[PDB]
């Protein structure tokens, strides 16, 4: 009568149990070493040469460094475009101004604000949450759809008389808010954006619908980034450094595996039909019975 | 505990295919929140060579090393990069014990023979059990490989921890 | 309305059997000259492992007879082969007896609800344990408000996970021993929620803890096996 | 003494004889000859005879009134035995298992009992987990409390009949079919509630999101696992959505009051179990229409109860106060009347 | 029927109408309300305490602010825009070792701090705390958990926290001399009412 | 007699609880009412409550035990001479020799 | 939705009415159902289909 | 006991009793099997919930009791539970044809496609939804199709399962097209997949060694059209298993008649255990069908 | 509920006398008409050379059965049974009965016997009656003929001939039969062929699909049962691939249209077996006549 | 008697001198086990006080 593997696996037990760490020393978790694993019987060999670990460290350095050098690319993009225009930035955002007010101090506050933003960048920032939906498949599909959509010819009166009708209302931007008097920056700002009917300037609002009012505060500064990866940098008064974010100096696969929006597999609790109303999550309870 | 037996059996089953040795892990309050643990959907893992960036892509480099050209239409390599990234991740078995316990005592409540060199009484508030598999390419394994770990929740967010495989095998592999 | 069945029963099984609430079951014996015997379910009690050893001692001390001896032999031949031999006939009306086509022991009776459902079907459940020496056949009689057969099998799997893993352990450990099924569901009828009375029983100057079922309508069910 | 005061509340039943008055020929009744339906059993046959009845009200206003006039037996016990909250939430346990075991050993309840599926609750109608006690001499009982502040000024709030939540929730005052103004009347604390001219009397009971809003709102009880078969005295007060749905015009309010606002309780068991399809009885509830509870005789010291009971008739209507001790008096002499007719 | 147990009367408005009828001993076991007495179906006294009340008072659901926090975020922020000057509250992660030296750099600026909600609750005296003149009544939800709104990443997010001890209860919900009477109660329980 | 409580009906715990409550209340309240009071109409309504509390007989011959002037006897009560003299001096307006 | 033309057109038996409250209060607070409270004189009773 | 009286809190007009009087001999579900019942638990309206699970409605409906609708008379319904065995008549509104010979099952109704959403009874918010009466092959077909939907779709992104179920949800049965509304996964559906996997593992285990190679033998012997399709399927499964050549079989050593009897009887037991997931027991056996396919006489 | 069944053909009074001995026995009719021609009575409309037994079982599964009641001068009074009511059925089956047996109805195996149905026939019509066999004998004889069908392909060797010679001879209480071999003229009948090929291919697709599907469900919450399922399949793989070439390279990636076709094919090929998997009981006996010529049986179904 | 028990509600009211209720009318008929656990089991409170 052959002993089933669960019995002598149960009576085998564990040799040893120890903790390990991540690279950045943020996570401690414990490994388990059963004596009855076939890894014990596989007698596999092991070696750790120093240039191999050095290559591992350089690869990990690049994998960390991707978003930080993207931030540096954004910063010297700002520097190049302020050197480009000569330093006289125009207004893109709808808010009134006062002539009898010294703009030298808000210019100095803008310099200090971009400095403090460079000190306090993050892997979770405005531009990362901006370009994370760009990595999706539907981003490419809707890019093709918009490139055929806006670049569509003027219609003849025949489809005006008999053809079916045609339909881009407001934008979903992200923002960094750097507050110099309290030395606190902001990384994740979700903001709705629109255009005024009377003038082409922008109007920003809360995702609930509340008007965003920080532009009146002179000590603060803001950075806006769009879903099509444009770039604004607004000091108070609505005047905006305007450019695009450069990423050609970064590899495709490093940005693609370092962070990417995730498409889900089907598990318990979700519909087989796509886009149906989701029921309640499984939510295993430490408060109720397991049942 | 129950995924450990099944994952050991399954990695023994598929060992001819991928040559991945199993790795049973437990995690506690020191890594994730209880709210993150009570509704954690699943966990992903990917073994990355010190020089090879994946095991799902081609071994001798890949065509995704050409840089992203800031293009509107295909953003980053199109969807081919996306389902290559869906191929480069793998799912692991997974259980959550939300009520607190002590794995010495708790593994004594289950029928195992807890045979440790010293009884360091370690206590945790919620024990999540999983088992990954790190890929020795041939029978030989390198210490400079790293192993990544995604934790995915039903909202779609994820947490990313990685660590190089020598740190798991400092005193374990030199013991053999 | 009642379907009559008259029976010639020998005197080697009339212990614990003069009461009306008795169920005779035609089991195929190993001996071929009667070809079958009308055993009582209380004799299925003493063989069972789920019952108490005190009631087993009572059943030993009340059934020192050669008929119950040989019946225990012929049911002790086939390991778990009882469902291929056991075949019911209905409850005794009055004892040489008459039968229709209700008392029950306290230990083998069980429920998985709070027995507050008004209509309650009754079922017989055998289970085959294999973590014993060869086979522990546990008999069970179950009253429950559920009516559909398959969800009863699903809640039985939810309640008998030990029997299922013991079954597959027997399958993976003994390859030359091929077991058929973990057990059998079969209904017998239904009662209301009120007639279930946990009471006493005295028979052959012997004591017993019984549960009586008064308004038991009888309906014969098939031996629907289940894993 | 811990840092709060518990305000308990209970629904106590009374068997009463109410009289009724009608004018001459208020309702014309339309009857027919009885019809027999035959059924055949094995030995007998059952004939179900049936007479139809139509009733036509021949009145514009109310041609018939009624009045509860006499009480003769009190079916409850007027007791202070606390509602077993573990029997109504049989699934919620503490996270650490040993402190939960120590808590159950510290209390009287013993085990977390598993609830049923949808199929078992579909077939079997009731749970009734708590069983009938040995001696039921006093009768059925209930008492459930609210953890409120010890600052709560009693003289405004406990001597007169009030809503026990801290805010007046009688929908006669609010305009009918106005759910927004009703929610602003019972939940908003930028305005004063109409009974007492303050924002509230207890923030742990009034506004949505308190302990009472998550404990006794049966809409909010659906979020966690609860037993519906027990009765809550607080259920007629913190059931916000049914109160908003009750906001109609006053004639329709009277209609739903004398048609649907009558509770049903099983009278056999000592625990107040919520009856269902109860045509055997119906417990009419004026306190639901008032959305207000009744002050009962309570005291602080045994000596002050002694000088209340020793004193003459009419003492229970008074309400005196010592330095730190106090007596609230019942507003109607129900103890006086119910003991004096005996 | 409904009735209070443990309800605390004030001391500044202390009075007694019945002093010829009754007189009690000066010990606070009779001078602090902790139990109550009711009447049965028959006219007989009965005692209600916390000891019978622990069958309810120790349930887990009384310590679950997660539905309370859920419906608080469904209530969300206060709607009136001029009443948003109270919610300013920062929970960020800072290097402690450099800041332990660098605390003069915090006072280098010349801008004041906004007052938190819990500081905005302590100033109310015992009787007007229930009036509409209070503003932070919408924060007070549970005796065991403080609730507030804080600006994190320029988002007004609700946050609850357990009041760890009973001293974290606000002054309008438990005044100062109430705690001193609690101390006299605990000294009379320990039989130290003449202190050394 | 205050509630329809014939022996064929079943009782629950609430029933017997309130029955025992009224048992104790009326055992204490009326033990020696001839020493509680000498009120005329109070013992009159007490004696009526005592009289109608008894159920009827099955067979009752209506010809038998009728008085003069067509009045019919419902029952018969009896005390000793002391209580009888007290009632005779007390309720004499409702007593008639016939 | 009742035929109010059938009420206004058909001959009606007269009564001494007695509403408890005022009749417009009873109409505005729905003691009954389907309350036709047209003011003036609506000639919509005239056309017959 | 048998005749079950229901009521209505609301009055019925002439239109309501008119559309009720064409519902005679329609089967309605009752959850309680009690006498003095109420109309809100009548039907499936208290149990219907979109985005909750079709399999939940299926399990509760096969757990529910059934009764027949006869003789309304104004605020009365007179439900009568059909006795077991005796011939009754039925009247279905489910747009599916019937047959004088087949059997029936009772399923939660699907949307046909015209999307009428009016089953000729509505009281305020409350509506009446009738369970579809479906002939037996369509019933086991929709059962097995939702089982394949639950079994296949685990650990897959939405596009591949969408491409599967746009052609899997559609069923054309006797010139009528049906689609399943709510295929969402369930814990109960997970225990069905559990019983499914254990049963197919057991029939993988104790099957005979000759039956594991029998289709190879019939492939080498005979070529038929269904045999060509079977060889296509089996060799594609073999090349998905192994790129090597599948060897020819020789004389089988372990030939034993009692061995085949025992292992194939246990195999038949396990196939019964697997089929009872999808094989629903009957509810109606047809004696006669009306020519307009509205009513029928069924023996149960 | 009575049926009339007339004969177009001339019948003798001696034909009535040899007909009236089958006074209370089951006949199948395909569907219930009130008056039916006798050419639909009995299985003679279905039995032929090239259909086989399993066709007769499958069309008997839905053929409505009817007891015979009376014989008249030209017509036959049939009586359809009802559920739960007792009736009298004569044992024309080849196996004796005992009290408490469970009876099923299966098609006869002695087609054109030495009895020739005791010579009850007509011009191009022999009246054929289905056997009423007890349920355990019914299920085991179904299994016996099926494993006869498996060995019908490999009839080259002689030990398989001795094994099927054991298979023909059946054993029962005073009953022995020589079961007819479904293979004739060195070829199988088509129904046994498709039944056995479908059964074997269900076993094959199970053995090659259970690993990936227990993995697909075992990525969810796990139990001991799926662990031992995987261990059982590991036992099968470790006793199975001892001679097969190593590295077969089964992939974890497989296109969806393969596996949905695999699952639906497995389900339809098991779906066409449930005529022979389930043995739908039709009768049980409450009293047996002496010499077992008849029995008072209660109808099921 | 223990010298601690309350007189103020136990001795003013007609009660059983044993301490527990023991009236045997609040018990079910012919239920001896419920009777004796009403009498002598101090794990349950009496129905009187």
Residue numbers in the entry:
A (entry chain M): 298 to 464, 468 to 591
B (entry chain M): 1 to 176
C (entry chain g): 44 to 138, 145 to 150, 165 to 290
D (entry chain a): 1029 to 1370
E (entry chain a): 393 to 588
F (entry chain B): 197 to 294
G (entry chain B): 1 to 49
H (entry chain h): 5 to 304
Reported in the publication:
We present the in situ structures of the symmetry-mismatched portal and the capsid vertex-specific components (CVSCs) of HCMV. There are four major components of HCMV capsids: the major capsid protein (MCP), the triplex dimer (Tri2), the triplex monomer (Tri1), and the smallest capsid protein (SCP). In this study, we show that the portal of HCMV is composed of a 12-fold symmetric (C12) main body, a 5-fold symmetric (C5) 10-helix anchor, and a 6-fold symmetric (C6) turret, and is specifically adapted to pack its large genome. The main functions of the herpesvirus capsid are to package, transport, and deliver the viral genome.
To explore this hypothesis, we obtained partially-enveloped nucleocapsids by treating HCMV intact virions with detergent immediately before cryoEM sample preparation. Using the same data processing strategy for that of the HCMV intact virion, we sequentially resolved the structures of the C5 portal vertex, the C12 portal, the C1 portal vertex, the C6 portal vertex and the C1 capsid of the partially-enveloped HCMV nucleocapsid at resolutions of 3.9 Å, 4.2 Å, 4.8 Å, 5.3 Å, and 6.3 Å, respectively. Compared with the intact virion, the portal vertex of the partially-enveloped nucleocapsid underwent substantial conformational changes. First, the portal turret was no longer latched by the N-latch of the P6 MCP and became largely disordered; albeit, the remaining turret densities still indicated some semblance of C6 symmetry. Second, while the portal vertex, including the triplexes, the MCPs, pp150 and the CVSCs, expanded outward and away from the symmetric axis using the portal-distal end of MCP floor region as a pivot point, the portal moved upwards about 1.9 Å. The trunk loop (aa 136–146) of Ta, Tri1, and part of the long helix of the P6 MCP Johnson-fold—involved in interactions with the portal turret and wing of the intact virion, respectively—became flexible. Our investigations with the partially-enveloped capsid showed that the portal and its surrounding capsid proteins undergo conformational changes once the virion envelope is ruptured. On the one hand, the outwards movement of the portal vertex would alleviate the inner capsid pressure to facilitate genome retention during nucleocapsid trafficking. On the other hand, the disassociation of the portal turret with the MCP N-latch and the subsequent structural disorder likely prime the nucleocapsid for genome ejection.
